[PDB]
């Protein structure tokens, strides 16, 4: 702990803590004219992260067995075009969301698109390579 | 008027009948309700409590 560290170690620990505490300070300064939106809730965030992890699990054997960064980047570009269309849809539907029910509906739609259409599209792509 | 709006309304009515045949009784993609039929936006958005990351 802090009492068990020397002066330089205390300096390093304080440095790391302060560098981690950036966002906290920015929480005090908010702008009036900004367009507020209901953010994606934590459970929906975790579900979307799990969907992305599932996509990465599907992708991993092929890209790790690929020895060409050009091919890996091509796969990434195609999957990113698909996911970016879906992300644009999600952002459009979330920014206009009137409440957490609407935000959850949009996040669930995006996750289902990843889990249903995304996996099939990625599987076809990886079968191409 | 009949020429112009005949072609336009023919297309509109074709769309209407096509969406009736599929029993689609929801509202189309560009329906803007009056303020009495619109969901108000929730202003109160309390951010999550800041917490130092263990990692």
């Amino acid at each position: 702990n802090v009492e068990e560290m020397d002066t330089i170690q205390k300096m390093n620990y304080e440095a790391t803590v302060n560098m981690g505490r950036q966002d906290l300070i920015t929480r005090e300064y908010t702008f009036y004219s900004d367009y507020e939106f209901i953010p994606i809730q934590e459970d929906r965030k975790q579900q979307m992260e799990d969907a992305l992890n599932n996509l990465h699990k599907i992708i991993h054997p092929t890209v790790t067995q690929l020895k060409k960064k050009a091919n890996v980047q091509e796969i990434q570009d195609r999957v990113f075009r698909k996911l970016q269309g879906w992300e644009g849809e999600l952002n459009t539907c979330v920014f206009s969301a009137k409440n957490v029910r609407d935000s959850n509906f949009c996040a669930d739609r995006f996750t289902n698109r990843i889990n249903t259409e995304g996996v099939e599209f990625v599987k076809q792509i990886l079968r191409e390579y | 008027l009949n020429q112009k709006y005949y072609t336009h309304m023919e297309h509109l009515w074709t769309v209407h009948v096509n969406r009736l045949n599929q029993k689609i009784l929801e509202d189309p993609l560009y329906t803007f309700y009056p303020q009495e039929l619109n969901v108000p936006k929730h202003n109160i958005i309390v951010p999550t409590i800041f917490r130092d990351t263990p990692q």
């Binding site: 029910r101 | 209407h16 009736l20 009784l25 929801e26 509202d27 993609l29 560009y30 969901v39």
Partner: peptide, 28 residues
């Protein structure tokens, strides 16, 4: 736009429910 299904007031459906039983729309 896209009115969300839970936020979609099916006004058309309402007008379809008030429609008589013989109008061509019901045939459609």
């Amino acid at each position: 736009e896209m009115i969300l299904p839970h936020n979609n007031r099916q006004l058309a459906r309402q007008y379809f429910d008030s429609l008589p039983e013989n109008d061509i729309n019901r045939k459609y």
